[PDB]
Amino acid sequence: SISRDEVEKCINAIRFLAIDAINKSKSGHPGMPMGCAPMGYVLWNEVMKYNPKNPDFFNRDRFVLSAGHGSMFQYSMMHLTGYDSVPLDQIKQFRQWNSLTPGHPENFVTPGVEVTTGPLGQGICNAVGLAVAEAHLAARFNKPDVKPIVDHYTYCILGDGCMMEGISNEACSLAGHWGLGKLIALYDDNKISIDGHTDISFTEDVAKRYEALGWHVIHVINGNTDVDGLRAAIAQAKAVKDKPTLIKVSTLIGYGSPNKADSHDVHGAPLGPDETAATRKNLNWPYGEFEVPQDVYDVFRGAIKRGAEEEANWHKACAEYKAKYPKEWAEFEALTSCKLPENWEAALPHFKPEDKGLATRQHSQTMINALAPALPGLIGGSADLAPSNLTLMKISGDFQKGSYAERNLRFGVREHAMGAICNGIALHKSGLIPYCATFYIFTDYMRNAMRMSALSEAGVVYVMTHDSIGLGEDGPTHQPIEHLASFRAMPDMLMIRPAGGNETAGAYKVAIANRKRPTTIALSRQNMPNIPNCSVEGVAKGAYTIHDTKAGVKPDVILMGTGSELELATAAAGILEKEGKNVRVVSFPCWELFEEQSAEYKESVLPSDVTARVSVEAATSFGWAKYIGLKGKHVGIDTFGASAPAPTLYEKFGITVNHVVEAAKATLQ
Amino acid sequence: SISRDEVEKCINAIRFLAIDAINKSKSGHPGMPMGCAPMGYVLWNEVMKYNPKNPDFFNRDRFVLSAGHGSMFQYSMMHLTGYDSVPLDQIKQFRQWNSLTPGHPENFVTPGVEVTTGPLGQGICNAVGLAVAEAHLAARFNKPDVKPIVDHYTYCILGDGCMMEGISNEACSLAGHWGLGKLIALYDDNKISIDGHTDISFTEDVAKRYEALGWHVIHVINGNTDVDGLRAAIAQAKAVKDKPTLIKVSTLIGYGSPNKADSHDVHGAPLGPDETAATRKNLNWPYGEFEVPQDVYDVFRGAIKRGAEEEANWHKACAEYKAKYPKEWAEFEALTSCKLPENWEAALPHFKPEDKGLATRQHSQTMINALAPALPGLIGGSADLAPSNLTLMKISGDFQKGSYAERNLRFGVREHAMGAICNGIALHKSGLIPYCATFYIFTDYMRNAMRMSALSEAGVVYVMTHDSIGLGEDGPTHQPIEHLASFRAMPDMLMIRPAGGNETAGAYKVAIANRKRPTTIALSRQNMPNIPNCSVEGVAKGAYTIHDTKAGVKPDVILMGTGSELELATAAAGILEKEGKNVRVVSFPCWELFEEQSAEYKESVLPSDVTARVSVEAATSFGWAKYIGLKGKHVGIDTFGASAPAPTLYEKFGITVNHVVEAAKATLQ
């Protein structure tokens, strides 16, 4: 193949592409890409299997840059190996408006970028999810007497910042526990973070911690020039079937810069023109700005013929499989196509007012079990709360290292990693539909991962029980107050709060339909009735009318409610009606969906000339003015809660039928 | 001395007080308290130095229950040893309205409870902070010549949940890095969590991970009956000065219950009548409901005498210290009183409009440096972003194992533990004023800790820079959108967004005065002018008027802005005024403070008959209807951002002077 001198020229081409891009943008991070260039060379030219001309090739290795600030590293590699989403012109538009080379890698913008990173620690956890998906599909579909149709590795580059974040310890505890032997993490061990040398705050023995988590650990003491040792480490990682592998690769940040290498000044500011000149001279690099010599392209652009071959070979393995296993093939194809099975929505049961009330956590359990046999891709579970959140799929066992084909994911007390893992599962783009769960209050532990589902267009289903003071005695550390508001404010997240059976089914219907946008479902601990006119379809409208006192007669006062509080509005309406008032009750299960409706629909629910308006929800008034206006009133709770039985809490905090009636009268003047 | 038999009676009294209390409430967690009773007996009767009749005794050892679901354990020990906050009638009111025995321990309700737990992992981190406070004060004030005036240990009991949470790895990494030898953590290694046996999701080698983090580890294989071994273990921990110590104590959850021990069924539900009778029989306990034998009280109530004597001996040591070191004593006394120095607010600078328009992050650095000499208790720092958040106190070094007297805390990339550690520092109740910092977007990593500051009444100052799209090219993973709304919605948190120098000084003034309520301050990356009539005092009003076209005449239109966008409102005002409109501009730095003002004040700023209202803020419209109404308009950004230079982002997303003008025209109808 080719020489050490050519390998070195290839390595330096990665460094100077990154340097020159960041000097032109006047913004970004040259240090990590300079220190990691040798790893790039090996991974892209020699190890990973991928098709640069088909970023969606199902059986490709997955790469994740968890250290997302080094985005020029990944962009350089993609450019060099011939991805059409990163031509030279896009290298020259790093960090500019509408480029395909944003400051941190974004899956939703750049074909070949698998997940969105930037928030340290997310990527490694996304990688654990990508490896979960590969292990699961492999266990479900590979057969011992033909070539596999699922067989690929998951590679992740991460730095010191990822290693300090708690979320990465969570995810990597789970990866050890699951024995995910095709996950290979490469740690850029460069002794530098933003504050300076890592000895200022970070002296732990990372390798020992990883051994404790159940990982194999390989030490590459010279990541700057030991290409043979990186080749050997990666080969050894692949021969460890049984445990995930951490390759601790010691580098100099900004390797090549004579004056700024090994300093935090090369972390995150361009080298600039004098040091750039000095680095060119120090690395013996006579090529001009953005000039990659053609012989380096000849090397890396070899990925194209290799990638076409790998993909053709896979198609042959699939043809051979399909010949002996036509039924299993059909199921594999239908799942990995990402198309939802025809009529899956018909699996959802329906309810009537006559049916005795259940908690929406119980309805949720019903929907998960109704859907699981209809949706082969449904996978997931709770963060140590299965007997409370009610999330188990009865038709499957527990995903474990003995048993990867099982579909219940048991995350333990690891909310944050759980959300990020689910992002990886979704973004494998294999038809897996991940759901995860905890008490709604503990969305606070996993908030960045949830925001990441929204930003990266990953249809993760967040199943969040015990949604209010209705949980009772556990008290204010466990009772949501600001949570609904905090999610309504978040861009591109659906926040659904169903009242009764039909609305819970309707929440799940929205959630499953939405394969490119996450849905958070707030569910009750306590029973609620099935209220007349509540419906599956109404949830899809976001807000809809469930009661008018007289057809064709404009309401005097509009009462709007969600979840367990909808019954307070319907009961208040009956009291106000018996007095002589005309009342509309509106159910408001999903504010985002309401805002997508036509102006005429919105006006049909909340007529602009009826300004007597009351909202009822066991949560803060914050946000509700959007619908209740300045002259309206909220019945809810804006303070923290308390430790007492639920019925006492509703009484003491004034979240009662009588309060809604009183507020309505106040709005009427 | 005390007999082995009598020690066993004492341990069983703890078990049955917990059991009996939980059966009466019909709610709560008997399993942990049953498994951990032997560790309670040893800690309370033999190890810890405390005065049950003075829960504020400055030199007490601090205990923290990180596994806060086992609250009846702590309440039983406090009752038995004579804390007046937990008489028997309060044990009989566990989890009931307005009791001093809430379902999870709350510092803000029960004197003697040091912090609030319930959310797994918080407590251990709070313990790291309490230990940081002791070490810092001991280094600052102890002299080699006389007895110490600061010398106490920090004990923490935590379980498997706490161990699984990433937050605890973060804080224990720092505890090891800082060599906090007076932190002693007792791990309830019971192999049980809510989902069942821990092997379902948690098989890591915890002991080896703690060794990697820099801790001493001691194994107690029989925490159920080996009292001598617990005694030895704790003694050995007090003799390792150099490292924090984890004592891994294996117990049987629910020890004593012949049918429900070692099962998740004893985790979280009362034993109930049949199993309680069976457990009484199995443990040979003839005493009735809530009946603690006289001889067991005679033992635990020994704490009263011992405590009086410990505190008196401390006073002697302080009298001896003060006789030799009058200067130092006076400083110690003044700090530790928690009273702020006379006229500390005069330290803060004032600004005029033609002063150079700095970023509010630069103004924040000025305030930090202004206050550090004036406020002896100011302590804290950034999560690896000192050079970008601009948070260093120039007059001090870095807190480290060699140098505990220094005041800058260098947290590394550990936002969540950083907040919880600060809660522990503040809640030491020794006059330390902690501040901590990251990019505002990463509040999402640390959200529960921040919430616990609010709930626990800890005046942590959250210094949060890069508050918007004004940061530019790092793009949407770094750009806040929903974050101002998400904190305005949080109970008992101040969310301040200062425009200019004076407002930034004003934000700091609020934040310092608030020792019992946290303050989050959203600060800009980018420069902004000092606007005429912006003021230190106006921040305290929450919203205030900075411009009227003509004094004494009602505005036609009200423009309200915050932070970097306030200049858009002022610039718009001028344009509207040239068209003949009378315009009022209102700066809105803190919503919570505005809502504290009188009805007359609020009406003076926002007259209820002027409905033409525009808000401008580079964040979502969510929430603003509270002030803008149904008829007003918001100029901001409700979507995620993008990776480009900041000026391009403002133009592209329409956050411009001319958009505010057109919106004001639209509201005028």
Ligand SMILES: Cc1ncc(C[n+]2csc(CCOP(=O)(O)OP(=O)(O)O)c2C)c(N)n1
């Ligand atoms: C969760 C989170 N916290 C903070 C930041 C801000 N930030 C960006 S890079 C960085 C330092 C990371 O150091 P390291 O991963 O070792 O990168 P190197 O400087 O070695 O390239 C930080 C703190 C971030 N991106 N995400």
Ligand SMILES: Cc1ncc(C[n+]2csc(CCOP(=O)(O)OP(=O)(O)O)c2C)c(N)n1
């Ligand atoms: C952050 C957080 N997530 C979830 C919970 C819900 N919860 C309460 S106790 C518990 C499990 C406790 O396991 P462990 O700490 O081992 O306690 P044990 O059952 O052994 O007493 C959980 C998951 C919580 N309290 N906090």
Ligand SMILES: [Mg+2]
């Ligand atoms: Mg580094």
Ligand SMILES: [Mg+2]
């Ligand atoms: Mg346990």
